[PDB]
Each structure stands twice: as C-alpha cells, then as structure tokens.
Amino acid sequence: MVSKGEELFTGVVPILVELDGDVNGHKFSVRGEGEGDATNGKLTLKFICTTGKLPVPWPTLVTTLVQCFSRYPDHMKRHDFFKSAMPEGYVQERTISFKDDGTYKTRAEVKFEGDTLVNRIELKGIDFKEDGNILGHKLEYNFNSHNVYITADKQKNGIKANFKIRHNVEDGSVQLADHYQQNTPIGDGPVLLPDNHYLSTQSVLSKDPNEKRDHMVLLEFVTAAGIT
Secondary structure, X not given: OOOHHHHOOOOXXXXXXXEEEEEOOEEEEEEEEEEEEOOOOEEEEEEEEOOOOOOOOHHHHOOOXXXXXXXXXXXXXXXXXXXXXXXXXXXXXXXXXXXXXXXXXXXXXXXXXXXXXXXXXXXXXXXXXXXXXXXXOOEOOOOEOOOEEEEEXXXXXXXXXXXXXXXXXXXXXXXXXXXXXXXXXXXXXXXXXXXXXXXXXXXXXXXXXXOOOOEEEEEEEEEEEOOO
C-alpha cells in the first residue's frame, strides 16, 4: 500500500532550507530550520537572514522558501508528484514577476539528505526599482494565498504551475507577483504525473521578540484538492 516516497513522510520530518540570493547586486543568504508533517499538511519553520538585513521583504520569499509536505487525501494519492520523486528529489524552477518592478528567477533542489528534507535555493533578481515596493520594503508582512493549480509537464517528467500572489503595499495599493513554476525529478526512476488538481495554503508569519536578527517565523498548512 504505502510507496517508498510516501513512507518517508508518515511522521514528522526535520527540514533545512538554505537560500543564496542576489537582487540588483544586493547579495544575501537565508537559513531556515523546522519540521513538516505531511499527514496534517503542517509546516513550522524559523528563518534568519545570515548576512544582516534582508534587502527584499520576507513575504516576497515565502513561496521560494517544500510542496512535498502537502496533505494529499487518500483518494488523490496517484497525483502526488512531489513525494513520488523522493528521496532523490526534484528541481523546482520559478520566475516571479513583480508588476511594475523586477523579476526573480529561482532554482531549488528539494531532496532528502539523510533523514532531513533539504531545500537548497539560488535566487537572482533583476530590473528592480531601488526605491520601489520590494527594495524599499513597502509591503505588509502576512500574505494571502488562493488555490494553486498543478498540471503535468510531460517534457520535464514533472509538473508545472502558474499562480498570482498579491501583497498589500503601505500606500494602499496592491503589488502583484506572477509566478510560473516547473519541477523536474532529480532521479531517473518513475514518478507520478498528476491529473489537474490544486494545492490550498494557509499561513501565518510572525516575529519572535527574543530574536535580534532579521527573521521570519512561519506556520503553514497545505492541502491538495480537486479530484474525488
């Protein structure tokens, strides 16, 4: 019944996230640690900017900073590409276009290293305005998700997705972030190629009053739906 890849996610799994970024020449790194519980779709992580002050807003990094922790209902278990690629993992590539501002490109590898699920990311941003909403830190902190639709990408032997995130800006406007995503398995073994469905996310981002460093505490639930 339970697949190798699924089996890796039956309990609580430690997570490590590492990002190296360069946005308009402003270089920065982020490290996060916590754990994920795919049974409940639950993530708890704390992130620190290891290089000082983050040059972009925390909320603009959330989507970049482990969809293998999604809760797939039993009846959707054929449609879980992310776990089927484990432990060897997958590459996750995105572009994130901020309307009337710059663009990020991101490349991540998500895989097991021992019993830890590791997300290692490189991020480059270009075309940003130095006093705009992103480099000017003009965004509100918590982010609002809506359903993210996943489809198979046959050429990649993986999945793709496109979705919009909107951030509130301090001047009452809304900052759009158009995401396009492609995921490719790292291994050469078979993976599940899903029928069309979606992931629904909820989150809270908070601060730890005892942390002096620039940081983000994240609580997240993710759950697959759309097939019965």
